[PDB]
Design an enzyme around this catalytic site. Structure first.
Site, PDB file in Angstrom:
ATOM      1  N   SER A   1      -0.968   2.096   2.223  1.00  0.00           N
ATOM      2  CA  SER A   1      -0.343   2.319   1.072  1.00  0.00           C
ATOM      3  C   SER A   1      -1.115   1.838  -0.179  1.00  0.00           C
ATOM      4  O   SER A   1      -1.920   2.436  -0.604  1.00  0.00           O
ATOM      5  CB  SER A   1       1.026   1.852   1.083  1.00  0.00           C
ATOM      6  OG  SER A   1       1.971   2.674   0.295  1.00  0.00           O
TER       7      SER A   1
ATOM      8  N   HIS B   1       7.134   6.841   0.470  1.00  0.00           N
ATOM      9  CA  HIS B   1       6.570   7.863   1.371  1.00  0.00           C
ATOM     10  C   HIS B   1       7.098   8.927   1.902  1.00  0.00           C
ATOM     11  O   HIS B   1       7.008   9.359   3.182  1.00  0.00           O
ATOM     12  CB  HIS B   1       5.920   7.097   2.440  1.00  0.00           C
ATOM     13  CG  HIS B   1       4.818   5.947   1.857  1.00  0.00           C
ATOM     14  ND1 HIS B   1       3.502   6.302   1.545  1.00  0.00           N
ATOM     15  CD2 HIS B   1       4.959   4.778   1.788  1.00  0.00           C
ATOM     16  CE1 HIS B   1       2.943   5.203   0.942  1.00  0.00           C
ATOM     17  NE2 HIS B   1       3.551   4.348   0.932  1.00  0.00           N
TER      18      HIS B   1
END
Ligand code: NI
Length: 305
Positions: free
Chosen positions: A88, A192
């Site tokens: 990420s 996400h």
């Protein structure tokens, strides 16, 4: 030989973790310049700030990137890894290693990334929860049926569900077969997932001030675990990833396809290294936690580069 340099994501940071790194000659100076550039006292959050201050998503993201860039820089005092990747936020860190973005541009982008995701999370009551135990495919089918999305597919059978607090609660009350626990993560919202759509818009605006270069080292992406050869495609993927699942599982599959023989996780390491020890048997792993870990890292670099 094939060495893969990876950078961690949110959750990896802990109070005072940057302390020893700031002690390296020149480190305080570099971090201070970064702090002035993004309007955030990185040194404070990495040394004196306690748990609640560094849990701040707008703080955690830039702090993690600065730590990764800083430890990597220290480790190269040079060398060039076979490939790079990150979890990420760690993807922005990896973009620096591949020469796609320079550090200040990356820290500026991630500062915006963190603020944008915090803001998106605020207009909603959402979150993320890890599923402990169970089968990954059955778990995904179940959580998705309940309206959640598999925000994190980290490999070794690990799955993180994300959605509204109501759905996350429904998931805990009606768990997927075999799942023992549904543990809520210490995050502001459903990162996400489509709930971050407004974060994409804001992050895209920040990406306008950047001119990404093509990666000089193989860059593996969270979206689908593929190697991205284009600098603009790398940047577009970073911007979109705030709202797309993290397929770290596929990234590790790609490391295998590349014949990875060693993996070094930059500061603050431990999380990705733990995953590698499970999903990548036979691969040497080393996590950089303090400058004292550098000598061992240099040896690993030397024999795998
Ligand atoms: Ni406090």
């Amino acid at each position: 030989h094939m060495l893969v340099l990876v950078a961690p994501g949110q959750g990896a940071q802990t109070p005072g973790f940057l302390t020893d790194w700031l002690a390296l000659p020149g480190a305080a100076d570099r971090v201070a310049a970064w702090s002035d550039a993004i309007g955030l006292d990185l040194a404070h959050f990495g040394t004196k700030a306690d748990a609640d201050e560094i849990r701040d998503t707008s703080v955690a993201q830039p702090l993690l990137v600065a730590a990764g860039i800083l430890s990597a820089a220290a480790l190269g005092t040079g060398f060039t890894p076979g490939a790079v990747a990150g979890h990420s936020v760690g993807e922005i860190t990896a973009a620096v290693f591949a020469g796609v973005l320079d550090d200040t541009a990356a820290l500026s982008l991630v500062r915006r990334r963190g603020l944008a995701m915090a803001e998106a999370a605020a207009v909603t009551e959402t979150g993320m929860s890890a599923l402990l135990g169970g089968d990954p495919e059955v778990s995904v089918a179940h959580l998705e049926r309940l309206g959640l999305t598999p925000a994190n597919v980290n490999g070794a059978g690990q799955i993180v569900a994300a959605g509204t607090m109501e759905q996350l609660a429904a998931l805990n009350e009606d768990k997927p077969e075999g799942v023992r626990k549904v543990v809520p993560l210490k995050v502001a919202g459903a990162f996400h997932t489509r709930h971050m759509a407004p974060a994409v818009d804001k992050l895209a605006e920040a990406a306008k001030a950047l001119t990404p270069a093509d990666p000089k080292v193989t860059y593996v992406s969270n979206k689908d675990g593929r190697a991205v050869a284009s600098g603009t495609e790398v940047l577009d993927r970073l911007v979109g990833q705030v709202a797309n699942p993290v397929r770290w599982d596929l990234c590790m599959e790609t490391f295998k396809e590349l014949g990875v023989t060693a993996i070094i996780e930059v500061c603050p390491g431990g999380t990705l290294t733990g995953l590698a020890k499970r999903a990548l048997p036979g691969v040497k792993t080393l996590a950089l936690k303090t400058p004292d870990d550098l000598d061992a890292a240099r040896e690993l670099v030397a024999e795998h580069t």
